[PDB]
């Protein structure tokens, strides 16, 4: 597919901002190592059919684009400094406004439909600005580019390092960039000190955080990429096979925890696990209303921690009942002591880039399964409408997934996973076998 780059510059925060260093907490410091790719899709018209394109004639202006850039780049200056170690080596922010990339280009031989489902595919992933990733101190914290399509439709690549945001705060950044340049002040500042997120003194953590111990191994084939949606209808089926016990006594079990179960199972059974094969399930959880009290509205950075059922497969493909009750109380074991003992734990490792969730972490026969649901994804509207999908830009590694909320309040979800080749071809066939 023919593309090209119309034009890149590095736009600059269109102020002063503190030339600060800006010390990462724990919970930043684990996240994966590269960037976070997001894709936007935004079409011409809809969805009647009515003309998306401004007065003025203007549909994703490059220039009110990148001026809305540097003024975001303000409050969220940090997003335009660049990695550095300290006195120690332990990665931080070195706030330094060396800008974030941002560019045009041109499909103009293809529409936007050209990819489909918008699964996280390899050729999904041109829409975002290419980083050298050899100069960690070099590369921007955040690349851009804005692709114009053969029938008027508009992609948006973002390309945003994990130590910086997570889907809250990186959300945040980019509604509040596309709130400026649709002419409309930022509802909530970024607090930038992540202080909150420090380690009690001493640390005290009070759990050996199975989430941090190394995931279990079978008792590289290149992986395939494909997405599934299921409809609110579905989704009811699904939770209806998990009988909500009455003599039990407790609440019933999150969406979440029965939809993970069911592609745990698919997952498992798709990879011919045995019954005796432990498998461990990473569910990134934000903390921002688990730990007490509240962190304050517009708090910068990452508040993940992350929730790791773990279980033989047997129990796992017995059945989506008996999966859902080891990932819910995986779940609800994330409190405010669980988390804040997370903390203190990770305060004591020495080098927590051994710590960082890679290929390794989430690899057969593990899973990563994240989820998006409650992400304000579908909330960047720049000035000419919401957008019709966003999603992963591709997903690094074997075993991780991504929960998807409906671009347009259908009920449906989507689950967007990577496995090996031969895995996901059964995986097809399985995950809507109910
Ligand atoms: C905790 C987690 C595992 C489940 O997230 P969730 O989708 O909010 O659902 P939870 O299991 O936390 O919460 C329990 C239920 O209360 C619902 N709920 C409670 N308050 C809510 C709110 N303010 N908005 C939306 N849903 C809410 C949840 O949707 C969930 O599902 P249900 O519809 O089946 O009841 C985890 O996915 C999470 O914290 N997600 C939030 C966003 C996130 O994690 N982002 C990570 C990307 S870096
Ligand atoms: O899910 C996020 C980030 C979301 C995001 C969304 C939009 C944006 O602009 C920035 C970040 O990161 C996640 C982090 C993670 C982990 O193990 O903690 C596993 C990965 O699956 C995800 O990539």
């Not at 400094?81 to 560019?103: H, K, P, S, T, Y």
């Not at 399509?149 to 508009?154: L, P």
Request: with cysteine; hydrophobic share 45%.
């Amino acid at each position: 597919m023919k593309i090209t780059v119309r034009g890149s510059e590095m736009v600059y925060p269109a102020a002063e901002t503190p030339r600060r260093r800006l010390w990462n907490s724990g919970p930043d410091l684990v996240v994966p190592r590269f960037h976070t790719p997001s894709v936007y899709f935004f079409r011409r018209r809809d969805a009647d059919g009515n003309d998306l394109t401004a007065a003025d004639g203007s549909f994703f202006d490059g220039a009110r684009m990148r001026r809305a850039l540097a003024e975001a780049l303000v409050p969220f200056y940090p997003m335009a400094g660049r990695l550095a170690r300290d006195e120690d080596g332990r990665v931080e922010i070195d706030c330094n406004a060396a800008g974030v990339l941002f560019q045009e280009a041109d499909a103009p031989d293809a529409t936007i439909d050209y990819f489909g489902d918008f699964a996280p595919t390899m050729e999904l992933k041109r829409l975002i600005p290419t980083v050298d990733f050899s100069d960690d101190t070099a590369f921007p914290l955040l690349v851009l580019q804005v692709t114009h399509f053969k029938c008027g439709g508009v992609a948006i690549g973002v390309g945003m390092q994990h130590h910086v945001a997570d889907g809250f705060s990186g959300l945040h950044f980019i509604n509040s960039w596309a709130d400026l340049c649709r002419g409309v002040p930022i509802a909530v500042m970024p607090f930038i000190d992540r202080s909150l997120l420090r380690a009690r003194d001493p640390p005290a953590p009070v759990y050996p955080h199975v989430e941090y111990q190394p995931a279990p191994a079978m008792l590289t084939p290149p992986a395939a990429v494909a997405i599934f949606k299921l409809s609110r209808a579905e989704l009811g089926r699904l939770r209806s096979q998990v009988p909500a016990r009455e003599r039990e006594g407790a609440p019933r079990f999150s969406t979440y925890a029965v939809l993970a179960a069911h592609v745990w199972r698919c997952a498992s059974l798709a990879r011919g696990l045995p019954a005796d094969q432990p498998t461990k399930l990473y569910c990134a959880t934000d903390g921002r209303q688990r730990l007490q009290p509240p962190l304050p509205e517009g708090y910068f950075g990452n508040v993940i921690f992350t929730a790791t059922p773990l279980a033989n497969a047997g129990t796992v493909t017995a059945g989506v009942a008996e999966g859902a009750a080891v990932i819910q109380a995986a779940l609800d074991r994330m409190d405010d002591g669980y988390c804040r003992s997370a903390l203190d734990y990770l305060e004591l490792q020495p080098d927590l880039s051994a710590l960082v969730r890679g290929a390794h972490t989430f690899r057969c026969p593990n899973l990563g399964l994240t989820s998006w649901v409650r992400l304000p994804i579908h909330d960047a509207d720049f000035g000419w409408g919401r957008p019709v999908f966003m999603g992963p830009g591709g997903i690094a590694y074997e075993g991780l997934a991504f929960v998807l909320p409906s671009a347009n309040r259908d009920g449906s979800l989507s689950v967007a996973i990577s496995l090996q080749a031969e895995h996901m071809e059964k995986f097809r066939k399985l995950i809507y076998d109910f």
